[PDB]
């Protein structure tokens, strides 16, 4: 897997319609809403933390999942799943392409160089704008320090700069 | 109806009075139309010229106009259809109409129906309406022989049913058997009025 800097910049149109894309990769994110998702339970919480993007860019699906585990594991063992709701707000609809000489990947991949340079599907990413909310945490005001620490941990696994915004519901 | 993607049809189409596919073919002729319409009691005949903002009607009359010439039969029998045709035919010529095209709407073009009965009277007045030779009713049904023979056979069989099946015929003063005689009576008074009018 190439460095994420190869796929950070938004350089072309979105590539999402999977009826026209051959071999479009499946989304390997198992869960998007962590904690207590039921609306009756979330009325206990009263504070909202948002990990907001600062630059527009593309976040790979593996980077989204990596930030998801480190943040959710920390809130699991420092806050308890019954004391928070954590949602990954974005979905990686954009399909990433790569142009490399490979195995049986179609007949036109055997031609080296920039001839027939349209790449094959190499992953998925989310295209985000500035101010877009990446992670959404509903929580109670006593655990504000822990939720910031978990969100700061998730920020360390993301390719673009992000800032934490804390506001009440 | 439901949702924005629903398409409500045309008002005349959804009310069920205008076949727009047939109307477009009629509008392609670029000639005045002879609208013939049928009701439970009366018959309508009109000479209509279509305009972009709405049809202009030149002459439009119902079967009530025959009372001006003392008609004493049923308002929408075959003979009443032919008499109604002559007046709209004559008044159309006084408005300058030399030719027209039949427009029977949602009615079937069965042979011998009253809609061709109305068109026959229009043709006799002097307005050319092109038509099929084998749909116009015969003279015997035009002059009401089918009505007279029905009453004459029914009187000799069930006279009690005579006074109910032709209850209004008697009160006008005309037994249905003299309808063929009465038809030639009315036809001269419509003819002589409009011919003598045409002299001046």
């Amino acid at each position: 897997a190439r460095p994420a800097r190869c796929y950070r910049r938004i350089k072309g149109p979105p590539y999402t319609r999977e009826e026209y894309i051959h071999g479009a990769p499946m989304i390997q994110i198992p869960k998007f809403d962590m904690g207590t998702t039921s609306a009756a339970a979330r009325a206990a919480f009263t504070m909202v933390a948002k990990l907001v993007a600062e630059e527009r860019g593309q976040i790979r699906m593996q980077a989204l999942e990596a930030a998801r585990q480190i943040s959710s594991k920390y809130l699991t063992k420092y806050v308890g799943d019954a004391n928070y709701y954590l949602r990954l707000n974005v979905v990686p609809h954009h399909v990433l392409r790569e142009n490399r000489m490979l195995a049986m990947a179609g007949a036109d991949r055997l031609q080296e160089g920039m001839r027939l340079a349209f790449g094959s599907p190499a992953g998925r990413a989310a295209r985000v704008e500035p101010g877009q909310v990446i992670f959404y945490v509903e929580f109670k005001p006593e655990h504000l320090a822990h939720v910031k620490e978990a969100l700061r941990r998730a920020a360390s696994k993301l390719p673009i700069p992000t800032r934490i915004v804390v506001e009440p519901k | 109806a439901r949702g924005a993607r629903y398409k409500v049809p045309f008002r005349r189409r959804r009310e069920g009075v205008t076949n727009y596919r047939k109307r477009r073919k009629l509008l392609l002729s670029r000639k005045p139309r002879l609208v013939v319409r049928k009701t439970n009691k009366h018959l309508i005949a009109q000479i209509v010229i279509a305009r972009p903002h709405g049809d202009e009607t030149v002459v439009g009359l119902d079967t009530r106009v025959l009372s001006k010439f003392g008609w004493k039969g049923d308002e929408n029998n075959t003979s009443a259809a032919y008499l109604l045709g002559l007046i709209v035919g004559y008044k159309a010529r006084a408005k300058g109409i030399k030719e027209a095209i039949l427009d029977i709407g949602l009615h079937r073009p069965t042979p011998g129906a009253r809609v061709f009965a109305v068109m026959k009277g229009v043709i006799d007045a002097g307005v050319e309406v092109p038509h099929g030779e084998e749909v116009v009713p015969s003279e015997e049904r035009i002059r009401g022989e089918h009505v007279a023979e029905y009453a004459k056979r029914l009187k000799e069989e069930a006279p009690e049913a005579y006074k109910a099946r032709f209850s209004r015929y008697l009160q006008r003063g005309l037994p249905p058997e003299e309808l063929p005689s009465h038809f030639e009576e009315v036809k001269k008074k419509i003819v002589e009025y409009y011919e003598q009018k045409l002299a001046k």
């Binding site: - | 924005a4 993607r5 629903y6 045309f10 509008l27 392609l28 972009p52 903002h53």
Partner: protein, 98 residues
């Protein structure tokens, strides 16, 4: 690959209709009797596409030169070239600007 040139080769958005304009179109455009010298707008009707002019003439203004049976002979221009369009009134509108 270079652009294919069918008679209607980029007419997806041009020939599409909104949901509110679905079905048969009204017959008032059949009832405009154009004379020689009047100005008309070429407005293609997607429901009668067999008799419609080319997409390059959409939105253009011509001069009625005459009638051919039931079509109207219309004189128009494409940039600098004088073109002769022969179309029925269902693909026309009167020009009210002059």
């Amino acid at each position: 690959v270079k652009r294919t040139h069918g008679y209607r080769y980029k007419s997806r958005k041009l020939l599409s209709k909104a949901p509110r304009e679905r079905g048969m179109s009204g017959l008032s455009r059949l009832l405009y009797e154009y004379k020689p010298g009047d100005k008309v707008v070429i407005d293609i009707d997607p429901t009668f596409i067999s008799t419609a002019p080319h997409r390059r003439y959409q939105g253009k203004v011509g001069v009625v030169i005459g009638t051919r049976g039931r079509a109207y002979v219309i004189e128009t221009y494409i940039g600098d070239k004088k073109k002769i369009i022969i179309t029925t009134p269902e693909h026309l509108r009167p020009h009210l600007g002059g």
